[PDB]
């Protein structure tokens, strides 16, 4: 995350971190339930074997609230391809259930029609992650979050050098240089409604980070609710 603020104690409890053999985070995820994590399909190419850490806000030290989980099943959307980055979504089933506690809790899955009519029409959502804090730089050791305006679909397409499919949406600023970045991929975009946070996007891609006239591109969760439901039973 470029700009934004630290996630303070309890503010982003649905954040997950995918960690490789070196125990370093390389992508985010969103906790959906005690057994399931939502993430980006393109993240699955970033590590041969990986695990999932929950409850972490600071990778520099252990606080006692962190927990690591092995992945039992990887469910990647069969239509994802790096040629288009379309269908950038995967669900992970964990070998053992997540213990919910301060800083560890699931985000809500919305219903499709209501989410599209009520959540995605709000002014802003929130993106979070341990990604780079400048376009050139290393991963953040601190979990960050950023309020990002929803962007008009037309303005979204005109800003992009690449095709924005119906499975994608834009959020961010036109001039203010704060946005998600490399390493935030796979992590939560959530939208608040009456103090309840629903997962609305998966960080997918962007042309650089926080560039003027560009936006973060997210996988639209509402486009995949049936696919997600099926994956959370298989």
């Amino acid at each position: 995350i470029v700009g934004g603020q630290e996630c303070k104690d309890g503010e982003c409890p649905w954040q997950a971190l995918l960690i490789n053999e070196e125990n370093e985070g390389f992508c985010g995820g969103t906790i959906l339930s005690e057994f399931y994590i939502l993430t980006a399909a393109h993240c699955l190419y970033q590590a041969k074997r990986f695990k999932v850490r929950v409850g972490d806000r600071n990778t520099e030290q252990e606080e006692g609230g962190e927990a690591v989980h092995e992945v039992e099943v990887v469910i990647k959307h069969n239509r994802f391809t790096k040629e288009t980055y379309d269908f950038d979504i995967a669900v992970l089933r964990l070998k053992t259930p997540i213990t919910f506690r301060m800083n560890v809790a699931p985000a809500c899955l919305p219903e499709r029609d209501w989410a599209e009519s009520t959540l995605m029409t709000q002014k802003t959502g929130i993106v979070s992650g341990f990604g780079r804090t400048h376009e050139k730089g290393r991963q953040s050791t601190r979990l960050k979050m950023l309020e990002v305006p929803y962007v008009d679909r037309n303005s979204c397409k005109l800003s992009s050098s690449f095709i924005i499919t119906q499975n994608m949406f834009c959020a961010g600023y036109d001039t203010k240089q704060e946005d998600a970045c490399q390493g935030d991929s796979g992590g939560p975009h959530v939208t608040r409604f009456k103090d309840t946070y629903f997962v609305t996007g998966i960080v997918s891609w962007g042309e650089g980070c926080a560039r003027k006239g560009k936006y973060g591109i997210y996988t639209k969760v509402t486009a995949f609710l049936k696919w997600i439901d099926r994956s959370m039973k298989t």
């Binding site: 309890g10 503010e11 409890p13 699931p106 985000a107 809500c108 919305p110 209501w114 309840t196």
Partner: protein, 52 residues
């Protein structure tokens, strides 16, 4: 106006059935007696920050 008028006064999901508002909730919540509010079934219901 129904659902378009302040989400039908629903805490969470709003649907229009027979020209009337019907509220519903995410998993882990139960619909309150008033048919509008959503009540958590346990600690750490989905979508709630853990600030206390």
């Amino acid at each position: 106006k129904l659902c378009s008028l302040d989400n039908g006064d629903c805490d969470q999901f709003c649907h229009e059935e027979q020209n009337s508002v019907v509220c519903s909730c995410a998993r882990g919540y139960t619909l309150a007696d008033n048919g509008k509010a959503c009540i958590p079934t346990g600690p750490y219901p989905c979508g709630k920050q853990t600030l206390e």
